[PDB]
Subunit: 344 residues, 5 copies
């Protein structure tokens, strides 16, 4: 017959009255648009900005009865992306965009095909920088739910409804992993229908659950803080007469733990509430600060001058108890700490 | 009848003489444009740049009597965003833009509908990076008023007037919170009418009051500075004969407080005036510097050599007074400090 | 009569022969364009890049005799910004642009009106990132002259001349302040006429004098460096026999002044010449380094072993002189330093 | 004859029915497109982002039988880049784009020529920021394979197939080197054919093997960590009675190795697994921490008080063994460390 | 006569057959394009990226015999920049672009004039971020040659040849200086003709020699490293019995030189080879590390216990030699260091 781009010009042209400014089934039931995404890339999950960059394929399927055809023999017509301003498309957008763009290198990365019954598959490649509010109450032990929601801008609910398709509404690429997180397989899919003073608009959202990787923050924060707590415990085996030894040991431990506690929040939003690393670095600062208060008690009691034999023997007694007591209380703190942030 | 995009072409076309270059009620009363915003996102409130990024819906309502219609049956006509260059729109802009853009992903995020009496609702999605001058006289205890003001660029006051609508002129999204601030519910709305050598132009502004969250700067700055002040107080329980103990303790405290004071302004504009954290870190540096001056007085008096018994007894006297005096003066400073920055 | 956009089409149309590609008074005297700017914002004055971002209104006034009219009743015609490609405009640019853009949000922020005698006022909103070479010979005590110059790109001097208007050629917004600088009221306005191998082109420039704010760099740099110099002076009251006290005091002062001197240039261009903060941090490093050389002289002379009584008495003599001499020489340095950088 | 741009208009025009929306050999065998790249620049290989920027020439060759000609005398026709919207081109894209753009300065950097048999050579200049997932199990001793893959967006496999040409499918510029890597000559070239719910699409990929340069991380990380381990060994030659000497030596070594271990990951993604520099900095932290535990054993045993002669002689024995044992165990660790990361 | 824009329409129009898609002297000798640049700005010479930003005027001169005219009286015709798509222009580009853009503020910054014999001067303003590979073998003492090369993209050598003009092919603006470099007056100009599998293309390049400024890196790196080497020399005047004095002095010097050596490469590419600052900071680290090894030899020999008088006298002997030997070997190193990096 005739080539399919010229058959498709006769289906959009001024003859037969196709208008791309007018939705299908006009003055009728609303247009059902079913959607699924394919996640190509996922990452750069910043927390100062509380956003994340994603790279998706956005597929949209609806039915335009004006685009049905029976003269042409074959079952689909790929419309060229140069001619996409000539058919109706839904005005989908993302309610938490914070910036987005198309991909237009070597060709506009757009795709459209029309079936004989008028089904329109429309797939485009988008980069999004989506805004998700972080919750950092238990910071290395948290699960983050970063969402993405797909709305209509102009058409209200009586004109256009979005749905997810039941055949796998969110696909993820095969070798897509994350450096700081893992992405769970189960993904929540529900409705987020918005009301304004203009009207009610359709909205569908997808929730992605991100569990952090534990092993980074152990190496940088938990293990070096635990060694300085042990470093304060070797003061209890040094002689009492070595005054600049046991004093200078407690000085350097209590101010490196001040340095370690500052760098524990070096890449974080300035939230007001306390978090799980903040109650680690505060309690571990309490051990290295009370280990130096132990020697100030030993240095004061032993210089109380039989009055000299009773003073040395009493100050020797606290130095035997504190060799047992401080690794015993720090042990029963690590029980109550790690059990609390494993059951939660 | 006929489809509404073709009815609306006859209302904008060369027949009946609609010109999009000419305001409504021309050579008459000025055009009353009433406006309200809907804040989607709000954040990245930088203070080096003294700006903030916002994401809004900007709704504008005016009346064009040329756009009234009575033939068409239904009560509103949604103009398609491809045809927005064909009607008159006000030339609103933001007097403190510092950069702005539209959102054009999957569709231009624009919306326009026309009522039968000629009312035009026009809503667009904008990202703004608005400039607000910070005032940091009492820096963790301040309330910041960051404004946004909406002006006319070309039309003067006799041609076009902006107003806020009385039915909630600033709406905020439901779960919109801030990491470092809270946004108060009451929002000032007043006029900011500008005069130039060109004419007088309409301006309406909205004021947003941002109160900081206290709890961040306690954990990083106030509490670690307070421990080093206590760390200088354990020198008064160490023996006088331990010279490298009490000297080396006062050295390390006075130079970590120098380090803590530098990082207190690590993310701030280089303002000339003194602020509330600067008078904390200066006075707390005075305690750790005068605690080391106490031992230099003890070390000088005790080496004055009955001449030896009077010198040891006098230098012992100041070491008993300073165990009481320095936690007593630092206590009555924290009364006068925190009362001053709670009443203000 | 007829609406003014259609009267203005007849004044630019193919009838009557108006060509926007041809300057006014062609083959005649040069076009006199008078200019003034209105500074909306001013700031982000970087010194690594040696630039500054400004936000201006650029008003241009010239006379086109082809645009004179007498049929129309009223005295001015606002041309719509959609039709600005249809009249002649001067090809002004900035010789130190380093990047610039227009503002096009909700409308192109452009403005044009034509008087009956043919005067054309043309105002546009521009953001510029203008390049100014810094001079940092006396860095906290300097006055910076950052310029902006306005040239013609295509038309030579015999075709087009730029001028400033005598009625306030540079206006500044009312509440426009700077965090690190102040902007003086008097602004130089002179000519910067360029010669190339193409021709001679018109240029007008405006000079803005920026005096720094003193009070920032006192708090961060001068005052903490002055305390470490005093911290080296308490070594002269500590006993000579306390060897790790007076040695360990001079060690920690001389290497924190090394740390303080590195951070004094943390946000500066890597200029080769010496500056006023560099001769502060070098001389203040000389006091804390010679205070430790004082004890190495005391420790060597006192161990020369009547031979023991003469050695202790001679080494005691330098420790009495240096308690007076080092705060006396540092006092007469601060006289010669601050007088030099107040008279300059 | 006639000029070649007018001969080429008759080959694309409405006469003879050339349609740029329709692939060659339509309703026939698929279009074979053979490709090769020329790498101009290569670098900025970030690992926080896990991407790399490349600058390429992308040459594509296919055959359009509609573009064959025999009237014109000469053997090739360079189509001008202004007229590239008039012929068919493949819709190639990059499956790991993460941002890309064209080069359009002084001319669109595009090139197209057509042979007499209808072969179309099409070369364009592209900048890409391609995403490659890093694997950092053995971080200074790793080989990274960063890929780039070239897909079809709209045409499925039955319509369009990509191939590499057998005559050098990846050329690299002559003096192209890397600061942190070397680029091996052998480059893998294989197929990456994608399946979606839309269809199967062609994909060819090229693999680039990047071996790091060893010599940087020796100078900054391995050598300064090895000196602090030696710095802990001079404690075994200092006298036992010098308590603040041997204690204060072990304090400062164990907390600079904490500082050196933090900066070893200062520019890295926050991966959970352990890497080769992490097992260097942990074991080297174990030597400087057990060298201080050696003196705490010496200080405890020597103060056990013939009871005094046996205690000094036993604590002297461990100080002779540890002068041999600690440089002997650190020597046999460096054998097992560097052999493991040379055989892998 | 008639206005020159209408005379120039008749010279480009469909009458007389001017085609902008066809080069001058077609099917003849190649087009000789002579070029010169005018450097407005120059700077931001990054070395992590190994690039530099420049701001130029690019003037191009060729001869089109189709553009010769004799009817018009005056000797040149300035074509308006709105009509630049209507004449032929060469497809120049930069082979090391790494990003570039035009300047389009208040007018496209473009310029074109045509003489009576058909000479076409074409000048445009470009910002470039050109890629130059750094060579850092002798880093503060190096001369960098950063090039820029100008190629043809589509036309081969038989169609288009680039040349520099002999009358000053590279001009630099008058007050253009650099903060970290100086720009030598003599500039190399030679050919860089490229061969591909497509053809051979013309290329001309210009070489700019950049000599660094010495005086920055003396103040930050060489002088503070030299003081810590002197700071290790005052240990040789402190008494041997002061064990925490001479030990704690050598500890703090050897770990600040570790800190100073890390910050010496804080803004550098991670190159594998050693450089001139790396052999300064390594040798200066060897002096402060061997000064602490000197005391460990003194502390071991003096505790060997006539056996006590011989041990003190031998350990006193090395402390007299090392007061002379270490400032003597560091003096003869600074001779061999600075002579080597002045002759090279
Ligand atoms: C879009 O989908 C829904 C159902 O999935 C359809 O809405 C219903 O249509 C039936 C009959 O037309 C009515 O009985 C219902 O009242 C409608 N609403 C609901 C919630 O079930 C709708 O017709 C579909 N639109 C199109 C064009 O097919
Ligand atoms: C816009 O609103 C104002 C009032 O809200 C109108 O301005 C007044 O109009 C009345 C009668 O037309 C006059 O008596 C007043 O002098 C006007 N000014 C004020 C300050 O009240 C104006 O007419 C409205 N414009 C339109 C098109 O409706
Ligand atoms: C632009 O302004 C200058 C004067 O401000 C005019 O130039 C002078 O014009 C007069 C008479 O036309 C001559 O006597 C002078 O030689 C001109 N030059 C100078 C330096 O005074 C010029 O005519 C004005 N151009 C227009 C269109 O008005
Ligand atoms: C593209 O290349 C392949 C071979 O390189 C061609 O595909 C084969 O064509 C032959 C005969 O046409 C068939 O026998 C084969 O079944 C085809 N497939 C394979 C895998 O060999 C193809 O014809 C070429 N397309 C064009 C337009 O030349
Ligand atoms: C461009 O310049 C070169 C010389 O500068 C010209 O090329 C030569 O032309 C002459 C006579 O036409 C020949 O004898 C030579 O063989 C050519 N090549 C060389 C290397 O000298 C060329 O003709 C000029 N092109 C134009 C249009 O003038």
């Amino acid at each position: 017959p005739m080539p399919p781009s010229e058959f498709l010009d006769k289906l959009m042209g001024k003859v037969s009255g196709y208008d791309a400014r007018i939705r299908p089934n006009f003055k009728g039931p609303p247009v059902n648009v079913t959607c699924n995404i394919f996640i190509n890339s996922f990452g750069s999950i910043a927390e100062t900005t509380m956003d994340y960059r994603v790279n998706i394929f956005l597929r949209q399927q609806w039915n335009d009865p004006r685009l049905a055809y029976s003269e042409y023999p074959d079952d689909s017509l790929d419309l060229d992306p140069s001619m996409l301003d000539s058919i109706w498309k839904p005005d989908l957008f993302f309610a938490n965009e914070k910036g987005a763009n198309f991909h237009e290198v070597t060709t506009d990365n757009k795709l459209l095909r029309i079936s004989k019954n008028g089904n329109v598959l429309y797939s485009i490649r988008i980069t999004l920088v989506l805004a998700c509010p972080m919750d950092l109450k238990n910071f290395p032990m948290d699960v983050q739910t970063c969402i993405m929601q797909l709305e209509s801008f102009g058409y209200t609910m009586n004109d256009l409804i979005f749905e997810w398709d039941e055949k796998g509404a969110v696909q993820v690429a095969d070798g897509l992993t994350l450096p700081q997180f893992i992405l769970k397989e189960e993904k929540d899919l529900r409705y987020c229908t918005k009301h304004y003073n203009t009207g009610k608009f359709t909205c569908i959202e997808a929730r992605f659950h991100l569990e952090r990787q534990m092993g980074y923050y152990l190496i940088q924060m938990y293990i070096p803080s635990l060694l300085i707590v042990i470093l304060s415990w070797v003061s209890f085996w040094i002689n009492m007469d070595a005054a600049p030894a046991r004093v200078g040991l407690g000085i350097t431990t209590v101010l490196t733990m001040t340095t370690q506690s500052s760098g524990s929040r070096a890449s974080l939003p300035k939230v007001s509430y306390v978090k799980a690393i903040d109650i680690w670095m505060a309690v571990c600062l309490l051990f290295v600060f009370s280990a130096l208060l132990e020697y100030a008690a030993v240095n004061f009691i032993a210089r109380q001058h039989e009055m000299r034999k009773l003073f040395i023997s009493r100050a020797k007694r606290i130095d035997t108890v504190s060799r047992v007591a401080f690794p015993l209380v720090f042990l029963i703190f690590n029980i109550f700490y790690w059990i609390t942030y494993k059951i939660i």
